[PDB]
Amino acid sequence: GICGIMALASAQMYSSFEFSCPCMPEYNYTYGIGLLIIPPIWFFLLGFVLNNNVSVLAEEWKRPTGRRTKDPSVLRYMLCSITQRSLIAPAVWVSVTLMDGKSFLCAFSINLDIEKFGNASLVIGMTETEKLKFLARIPCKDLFEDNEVRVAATRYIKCISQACGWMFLLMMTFTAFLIRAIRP
Amino acid sequence: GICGIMALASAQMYSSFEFSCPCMPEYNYTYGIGLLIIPPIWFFLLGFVLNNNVSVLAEEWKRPTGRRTKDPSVLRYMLCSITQRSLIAPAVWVSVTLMDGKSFLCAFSINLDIEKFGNASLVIGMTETEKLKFLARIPCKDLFEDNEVRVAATRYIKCISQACGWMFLLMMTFTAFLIRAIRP
Amino acid sequence: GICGIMALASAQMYSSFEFSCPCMPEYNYTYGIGLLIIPPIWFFLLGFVLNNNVSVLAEEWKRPTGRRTKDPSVLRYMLCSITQRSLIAPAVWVSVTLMDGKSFLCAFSINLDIEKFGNASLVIGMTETEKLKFLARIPCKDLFEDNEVRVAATRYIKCISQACGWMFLLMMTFTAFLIRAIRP
Amino acid sequence: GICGIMALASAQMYSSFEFSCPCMPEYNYTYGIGLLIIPPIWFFLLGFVLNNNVSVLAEEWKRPTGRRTKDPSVLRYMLCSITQRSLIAPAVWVSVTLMDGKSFLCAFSINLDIEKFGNASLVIGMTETEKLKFLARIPCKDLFEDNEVRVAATRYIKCISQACGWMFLLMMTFTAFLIRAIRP
Amino acid sequence: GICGIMALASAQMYSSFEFSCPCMPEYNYTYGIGLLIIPPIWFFLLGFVLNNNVSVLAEEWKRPTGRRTKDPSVLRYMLCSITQRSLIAPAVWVSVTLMDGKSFLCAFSINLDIEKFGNASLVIGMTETEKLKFLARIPCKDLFEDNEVRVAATRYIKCISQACGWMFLLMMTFTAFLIRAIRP
Amino acid sequence: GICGIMALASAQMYSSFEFSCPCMPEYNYTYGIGLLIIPPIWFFLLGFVLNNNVSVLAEEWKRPTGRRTKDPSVLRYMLCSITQRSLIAPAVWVSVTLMDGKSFLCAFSINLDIEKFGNASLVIGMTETEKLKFLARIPCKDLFEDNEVRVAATRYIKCISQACGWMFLLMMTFTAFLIRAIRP
Amino acid sequence: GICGIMALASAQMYSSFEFSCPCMPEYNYTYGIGLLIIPPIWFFLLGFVLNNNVSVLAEEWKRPTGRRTKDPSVLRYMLCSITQRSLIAPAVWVSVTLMDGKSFLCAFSINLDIEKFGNASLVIGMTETEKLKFLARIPCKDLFEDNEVRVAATRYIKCISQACGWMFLLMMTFTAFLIRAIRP
Amino acid sequence: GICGIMALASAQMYSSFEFSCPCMPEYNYTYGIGLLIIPPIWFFLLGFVLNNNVSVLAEEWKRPTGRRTKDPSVLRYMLCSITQRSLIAPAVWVSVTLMDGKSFLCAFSINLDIEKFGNASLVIGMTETEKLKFLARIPCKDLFEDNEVRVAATRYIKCISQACGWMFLLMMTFTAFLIRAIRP
């Protein structure tokens, strides 16, 4: 119920989210990786909070030994089962974020090698500080002057991000395959 | 019921609201921060007023001691529970307002350092009064002459506002996590 | 029932209303303030007329003393309660009219000080009659020649109108908060 | 039932009606005032015809004295009540027609004073016949040469028509207020 | 039932009908008046044919005197009542056709006086045959060279057609008013 | 049931059909008249095939005399009644095809007289073979060079096709009027 | 049920199919005729596979003589009846494919005679290999240089394909007419 | 149920997927073939995971011999039946991916022979490394300079991919035809 609702909400919240990459070398990595990390953590704690069966977990965690009516075997089972139920909306966020490649373009555009894409006369005679300030404006469509380099560098990091998007989806599905094959 | 209605109404009222930043240095801060503060206060008092269970709170607050049929333990519990039920539509407003970054762009565009973004020849030979009147027109798209500086300064304060939007959402969710883990 | 219908009708009638500011100094104030005053009075008398419980008020007001089956205590209560039920659609009109700022732009564009916005060479060597005829055409987009002054003066009176729109909404909600806290 | 249907039909028939002002001085007044008068008369006789309770009025009007089973007190009451029920769709027509101001622009554009709006060199050296033929083409957007005079004269008669539209709505609502306060 | 269906079908069939005026003086009058006359005759015979109560009229008309089980008083009543029920979809066609004025523009554009609208130098030195071939192309937007004369002549015959459209609607409604006031 | 379905299907299949007139004099007549004749024949045999009451007609036609349980009076009645039920979707096709006039424009554009429409200098000094190849490209919008002649010739054959469309609808309705007045 | 579903699916799958004619003389015929032949064969085997009554056909075909509970008379009847039920979605595909004429344009544009359409100076002094490579690019809108020849050759093969589309529909309907007139 | 859901989800996930071919010769083949191979493997393991009848397969696979309540004949039958039920959403992906031809264009554009399409003067005097870097940018619309070669090479590999798309659909349907003809 709420698992399918939060999975649809995670894809819908990414669609309405307006990605504003700062295009500065100090704040590209923390913004690009931070939108890959911090909204999954919020969707994970939303999976604890919106599920009202954390309250029964709370009452059987707060009371000391002797008062525990249920054995902790079903407690370990339920806390595990509520984690792998609340691990869908984080995984849907990291799926669609890696499929679009906006965060890999924002975070990893200062690690590129510019000789592979377009003119070799771009960065000639330019210091590492100004070269980092030149490479960082690649995700900004209206701040980069060379359009052919910008489409070449966008397609390179978007295909790598889509490769990591499918390798993440295969590792997640194969993990849930092993979970529903040995544990219940 | 009305909590989900007011949460959807707060996001819908922001979408129909037309943000008109004054682009004057005397009235940028009060308008930009005021749209972050004053509509949450109105949505908080709307959470008291539209909930008709403030009337039973009113009758057990007006009558003096001796006439009180209920002990004030359930009174403290209910006034607390109606506050954390009416703290959703304010929090949805501050969420979407910080996600768009229009108020942080309107209020904090007189605190910028203009050397980081574009031409260094912009503010040379210009007094602090005219420099404040030059920096204040950054949120106004049709009043600013340098477009590359305007997109650079917009993206800088929009990513900082989105960082504060996610840090607010994490602090709010972790607070409600502790509330539903110790109190009921 | 009809309170929510008239509240939605007041917002919908403003959306279909085509604001035609006359852009003349004799008729700006009466048209701009008159659209803020006269449609709330019509929506207030519509709250009396469409509510068929004004007929029972009519019969117990027309008959003299002695024939009055009900005591006037419930009569004062019901006439008060029908006023604060019919004070929603007027308040929704003044809310959305102040949020858009078209009436404050139409009525108060002859009180502006033109040195704050754009060129100081606009009104130089111009008589008070022609200066009033120059300032009055600010709300008319297709009658004003200086576009930068027009957007600056529009944003100034629209933010002031939105400030008065939120101060009206706070004073109205805090008043209805006190009404539902002492009276019933 | 049919009162709300005819009220919605009167607003919908005005929206689909294509206003073709003749822009001739002989036929502006009769067309502009005639669309304000003649469609309310048709909607009034439609309120008699579509209401099948005119047939019982017909049978108790045709038979002479002695055969009248009902006293004429309920006959005066019912003929009055069917008039104030069939006076809604005429009033909705005159409301929306005065709110748009197309008929006041078509009928009263030969009464204007052209010095108030634009160039004083328009009508200089021009006979009353050609001046009437020049002023009459104001509602025709594609027949008038001076666009600034045309928008100024349109906004002047549209705000006056909207003033008469609200004064008509206030006089109609206050009349129906007195009707439902003394008569039943 | 089928009366409201045929009334909506007559307005819908006019909306999907593509008016192709021939713009020739031999065939303007027969096409323009013929679309005002011939589709009402087809909708009138459709009111006889689709109403299956013409079959009982057929059986009591074919059998001679002596075999007639019903007296012809109800036969005159029913044939009259089926005519005034099948006189709605013809009247809706002539209503919307006169409201748009395309047939009056097509049929009566050879009767115009061209001095009233635009340049007097249009028809100077031109024979009655070529003048009829010049006036006939007024309804054709892409065959007439003088656009100001074309909009002036269109608005003249469209307002006259809308005057005859409202005088037809008043004469039809007042006739049906007298029918439902004396006959049943 | 299926009569109204096939009538709506015939109008819908014409709307989705893309009329590609060949614009060659050998194949204009057979294509233009063939789309008026051959799809009505297919819709007529579809009226036999989709109606499953052709099977009972088949069994009482195949068996010789003596085995016929029903007299052939109801057989003549039913085969006639299934023809005039399956004569609606052919008639709807010929109605909408003559209302649009594309087939009369495609088939009869080699019979025109070109002096009536535009320049007399078009076909001067041109052989009957090249004149037939010049007149045949009138329905092709992107193959004809003279646009004023093309709109004049299109409007001439479209009004004649709409005249034959209404004369067909009157002859069909008057025929079905006589059928439902004498036969049942 | 599934017959009407597969018929609607065949028309819908053609509408979403993007026709990419190769415009090479070696692969025009096999692609153009192959899209007319191979998708009907797939829709025919889909009519066997999706119909689960092929399994009962499978069990009474695999078992040898003696074990056959049903006589093969109903087996011949059912295998025939399932073929003429699964011959609808192939026939709908060949219908809409011949109505659009894209396959006849792709497959038969190397058989054309180019003197009939446009300039005779196109193929003069050109070898059969380059003439086949010139004629093959007729279905490709963005690979053919002469647009008037391309629209003339498109309209010629599209009208011939629509002629074969209607002759196929007449031969198919007349065949199904004979089937439902002699066999059941 | 979930088979038709996953089949519609596979076609819908391809429609929302944004194909970003890297247009580099090292990473064209692995990206183009990898999007044909890796998403079918994920949809195949999704057919195991979302079907909860893998848990009963898990319990009867983990327990050793002696504890097996069911014989492994129904185990081989069910594991086979769940594979041919979960082989629909992979097959729908490879169907629509080969129908669009984007992966065959991305993976096989370094194997082309450029003399067949356009100018022979393109690759003259160019090394195999730069020729591979020139041919690889064919799927990139905004990175290839010769548009006529790009449309010719796109149509060549899209028709070959559509040929392999129909040969895959015929081999898959004929295989499922043999499965439902011998096995159950």
Curated annotation (Swiss-Prot), chains A, B, C, D, E, F, G, H:
Glycosylation sites: 119
Extracellular membrane side: 17-28, 105-157
Residue ranges, annotated region (Phospholipid-binding): 42-49, 84-96, 169-179
Regulation: Activated in response to membrane depolarization and low extracellular Ca(2+) concentration. Inhibited by ruthenium red.
Subunit record text: Oligomerizes to form hexamers and octamers. Does not form gap junctions. Associates with CALHM3 as a pore-forming subunit in a hetero-hexameric channel complex.
Function: Pore-forming subunit of a voltage-gated ion channel. Has poor ion selectivity and forms a wide pore that mediates permeation of small ions including Ca(2+), Na(+), K(+) and Cl(-), as well as larger ions such as ATP(4-).
Entry protein name: Calcium homeostasis modulator 1
Species name: Oryzias latipes
Lineage: Eukaryota, Metazoa, Chordata, Craniata, Vertebrata
